[PDB]
Design a binder for this molecule. Structure first.
Ligand SMILES: [Fe+2]
Ligand SMILES: [Fe+2]
Lengths: 392, 388
């Protein structure tokens, strides 16, 4: 149901800006994600650019921005880091600690200095004080959950032509094309306990609850900004049970709280999935086994009035799950872990519905249109369990 | 000129090369796509291995293993590679970043290779052990934190994925780009003489070639000479900082500088590889300017056609020759973040010594190592700095 929205953000939160993974080797991670996701390299900051502290590669597709960063070892001169908050020692420990993982969830805000200030005044634990990067660009960080930080980035609307962040050199893509992913939809974190994680996070941002799924194996709650275009869910495990909670399994292998999955939206998910799946065999990402025709007979009954046989067929061929909503239709699919451990994975989706306008010809879509796959949980759990037992 | 055939143990050929990292999935995936080597075997949590995640890529006879250690809830006993040590691997990655940890050769008897090696000076790294099904493994120190690994197994075991404990992975939707075998693997050390004395000393590998130019080099080889393992040391002086020292500096010690991978049709191979550079594959050294190709016409116009020279020029491949042999070669830019490890793609033309029946055995090293191209090499990187 639609939960009330008290529009209580403590600072103006515009939208997701980017995500940064602190890696063992940026070249490797960025390189694989670039062809695996169809996100050409767009900016860079490394030795070739005068940064001898860290190597950073920014991949982009539509409005999706993925930053991959790794520390140099010797001859490293910290003062040359394009990202002032970088810590070689911290990064090195991060990589050994979790393998491939998300370090920063960055949101564009009206003013990074005021967002930090209002955040710390409301309990946020500071991670990196506000600094100017140049051209009206500001950055600040506070602790989100575990060793993941919530990063604030602000700049004049007129500076949006910047490749990424000051200090980053733009990279052109002439012999390059994307697969259709356009934006981050939601970023989910796993914590040992929801309430305290939620109280701290909602308490310093003013973000409100948009949705919740409670019980197997987990309790989830989605937090959103005023306009609800920024969605940050949190999961906690449910103890006891039969098999170990999939949430606990992550905390165990990951070694603590962290980003579990990131949902990436496409406006034509079928075209996008075909491109990704064509790359699976040679280093790309793999997807969860497609459900069986029974599941799909069910989608014909559940939503045969929005998808066409040739579409539902495509869905079954790729392994896409389909959910219906009081006001929208959701197509979603999950990849297998993108790193060495069964921790971080990706979700690819497309939302159908909830379109409206704002005195302009551009028709915007309501955030979270179609839900989060509540109807598919049953199947998702069965696919996960089966694969689990399959791993014995 | 003289092959003393002094091997202290039976060295059959290159078996695989293992790179250690904190993140093997990323490295393996990028390399798979960049080299055209589909996944052929794995050993990890999904196979009962909670100590390390290992991925084996393969193209023809080339085998690349990528390994990273698990951090929490790990059982060391479950390692498929008994020599693996989590703490040593973590330290290795923080020290060198993405790099080659092991150069593995297939030998007659791994135990015999080890015993014969330490009997002659080798620093032991891991004692011989039986992995099961006739498979044996041992390791000794090569240079720095890189080890020379020995594996052995009966010709009937060849019917298995990799080493016991590794699960085979089928690649129905996967095709390679023509890379078929390792040609040579080069290590950089601070001082050549002692390192080469040590290395040639415990293996019995003889000196195949030598280049005394800012670096000096010796190429050691096994009896059949199908295993070539060169060494470089930097020569200090003049102005420019030795590219060999740059490696040592950024890498933090001795280590593998480059691996030359051979293809039977390198032009065909390079087109596939270069078509993927823009999307995460590997980048190469910018092509030499046309005057260089005016040069290969002059120097190899008798063995290569105009169409073939232009193809080389489009791809940026360098050409060189010796007596009875032609070498085609190209260098990629660093494969990881640090200006250290890189790859060399080549094809050797000639030295097809046979008894009139058909192509079956080419002498190793046919065409040299690119001596005639060093000057273009110095110029290509100079053109990089002189283009910030
Ligand atoms: Fe999701
Ligand atoms: Fe070479």
């Amino acid at each position: 149901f639609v939960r009330f929205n008290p529009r209580s953000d403590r600072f103006h939160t515009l939208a997701f800006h980017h995500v940064e993974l602190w890696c063992a080797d940026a070249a490797s991670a960025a390189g694989r994600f670039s062809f695996g996701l169809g996100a050409p390299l767009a900016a860079r900051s490394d030795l070739s650019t005068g940064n001898s502290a860290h190597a950073s590669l920014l991949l982009r597709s539509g409005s999706l921005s993925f930053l991959f960063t790794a520390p140099y070892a010797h001859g490293a001169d910290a003062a040359t880091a394009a990202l002032p908050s970088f810590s070689a020692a911290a990064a090195r420990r991060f990589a050994a600690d979790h393998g491939l993982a998300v370090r920063a969830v960055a949101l564009r805000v009206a003013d990074a200095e005021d967002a930090f200030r209002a955040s710390v005044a409301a309990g946020a634990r500071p991670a990196f004080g506000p600094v100017d990067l140049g051209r009206g660009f500001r950055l600040a960080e506070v602790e989100l959950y575990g060793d993941v930080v919530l990063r604030y980035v602000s700049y004049p609307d007129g500076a949006a032509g910047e490749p990424f962040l000051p200090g980053f050199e733009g990279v052109a893509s002439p012999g390059a094309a994307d697969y259709g992913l356009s934006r981050f939809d939601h970023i989910v974190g796993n914590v040992p306990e929801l309430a305290p994680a939620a109280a701290y996070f909602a308490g310093f941002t003013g973000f409100h609850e948009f949705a919740e799924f409670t019980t197997s194996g987990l309790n989830s709650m989605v937090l959103a900004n005023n306009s609800e275009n920024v969605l940050l869910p949190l999961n906690e495990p449910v103890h006891g049970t039969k098999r170990r909670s999939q949430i606990q399994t992550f905390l165990d292998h990951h070694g603590g709280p962290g980003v579990q999955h990131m949902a990436l939206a496409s406006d034509d998910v079928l075209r996008t999935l075909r491109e990704m799946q064509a790359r699976s065999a040679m280093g790309g990402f793999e997807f969860m086994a497609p459900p069986t025709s029974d599941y799909y007979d069910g989608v014909r009954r559940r939503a045969g009035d929005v998808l066409t046989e040739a579409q539902i067929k495509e869905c079954q061929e790729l392994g896409v799950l389909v959910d219906r909503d009081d006001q929208g239709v959701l197509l979603q699919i999950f990849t297998k872990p993108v790193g060495d451990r069964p921790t971080l994975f990706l979700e690819i989706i497309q939302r159908i519905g909830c379109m409206e306008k704002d005195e302009k010809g551009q028709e915007y879509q309501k955030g979270g249109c179609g839900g989060f796959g509540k109807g598919n949980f049953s199947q998702l759990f069965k696919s996960i369990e089966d694969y689990e037992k399959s791993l014995e």
